[PDB]
Amino acid sequence: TNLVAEPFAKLEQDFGGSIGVYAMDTGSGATVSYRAEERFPLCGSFKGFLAAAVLARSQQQAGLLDTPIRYGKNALVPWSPISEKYLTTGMTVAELSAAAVQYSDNAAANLLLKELGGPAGLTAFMRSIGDTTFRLDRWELELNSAIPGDARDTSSPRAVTESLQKLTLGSALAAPQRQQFVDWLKGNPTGNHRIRAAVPADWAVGDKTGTCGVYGTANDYAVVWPTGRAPIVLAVYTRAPNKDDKHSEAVIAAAARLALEGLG
Numbered sequence: 001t002n003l004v005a006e007p008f009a010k011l012e013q014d015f016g017g018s019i020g021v022y023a024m025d026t027g028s029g030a031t032v033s034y035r036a037e038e039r040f041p042l043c044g045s046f047k048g049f050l051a052a053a054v055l056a057r058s059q060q061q062a063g064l065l066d067t068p069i070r071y072g073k074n075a076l077v078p079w080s081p082i083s084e085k086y087l088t089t090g091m092t093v094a095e096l097s098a099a100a101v102q103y104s105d106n107a108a109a110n111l112l113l114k115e116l117g118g119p120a121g122l123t124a125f126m127r128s129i130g131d132t133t134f135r136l137d138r139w140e141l142e143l144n145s146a147i148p149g150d151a152r153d154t155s156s157p158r159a160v161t162e163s164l165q166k167l168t169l170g171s172a173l174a175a176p177q178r179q180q181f182v183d184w185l186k187g188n189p190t191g192n193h194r195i196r197a198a199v200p201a202d203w204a205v206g207d208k209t210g211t212c213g214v215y216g217t218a219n220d221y222a223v224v225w226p227t228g229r230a231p232i233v234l235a236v237y238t239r240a241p242n243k244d245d246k247h248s249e250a251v252i253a254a255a256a257r258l259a260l261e262g263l264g
């Protein structure tokens with residue numbers, strides 16, 4: 001593990017913070033781990049799991065995805081580029097889910113959380129798939145505070161990867177819901193400088209990013225489909241000690257590359 005870990009330790013020292021990584025080869029079972037059981041703030045990365053929770057609920061409530069959500073101005077919070085434009089008409093549950101995943105739309109995220117029973121409702125969904133580490137405690141935007149020591153609104157790289165594998169490749173979602181989730185992740189355009197930058201262009205990637213805006217705290221998780229080979233699932237999370245420390249997309253891409261090259 002010393003030869004596995006040392007390049008990650010070098011990377012986080014030059015970054016000036018902490019990096020957590022977990023990667024799983026779903027064919028062979030091989031893994032790469034660094035700080036994989038430590039907690040890191042989720043920031044907007046929870047929005048991918050939120051869409052999965054909505055899709056899972058649609059397996060018990062036919063027509064949930066078509067349900068219209070007609071909201072007022074008070075539902076709008078900062079960084080709501082899609083939901084801001086449909087204030088005059090409303091949006092359906094599926095349209096809000098797409099916006100939360102692919103634009104990180106905050107109002108859409110809060111509206112979907114409300115449908116699920118709040119942050120506690122998303123945490124309960126994660127428990128239902130066997131994830132005991134994930135916890136969402138607050139709403140947008142308070143969940144982005146990323147204060148050192150605080151376990152609220154955190155998970156671990158290993159738990160993120162394990163849950164992502166269950167939802168995108170395992171049995172948690174039925175085939176139509178599973179392909180919708182995978183398509184939302186694959187079409188996400190916000191992570192071109194993160195895990196995607198470490199992956200050969202020929203290989204499809206689906207990802208969800210998060211960027212708290214403070215404490216150098218940012219992240220990305222992804223499924224990678226190498227051609228003609230079993231997919232890889234991985235998660236890369238960062239944080240830093242000072243409130244004004246800057247996050248780095250380059251550090252996330254570099255850590256992703258170190259993990260992908262070390263699988264085997």
Ligand SMILES: C[C@@H](O)[C@@H](C(=O)O)[C@H]1CC(SCCNC=N)=C(C(=O)O)N1
Nearest residue numbers: 043044045079104144190209210211212
């Ligand atoms: C709300 C804000 O803190 C942040 C988050 O939820 O984590 C929003 C803003 C951003 S927009 C990303 C812009 N990409 C720049 N390269 C993200 C994200 O990283 O997905 N989500």
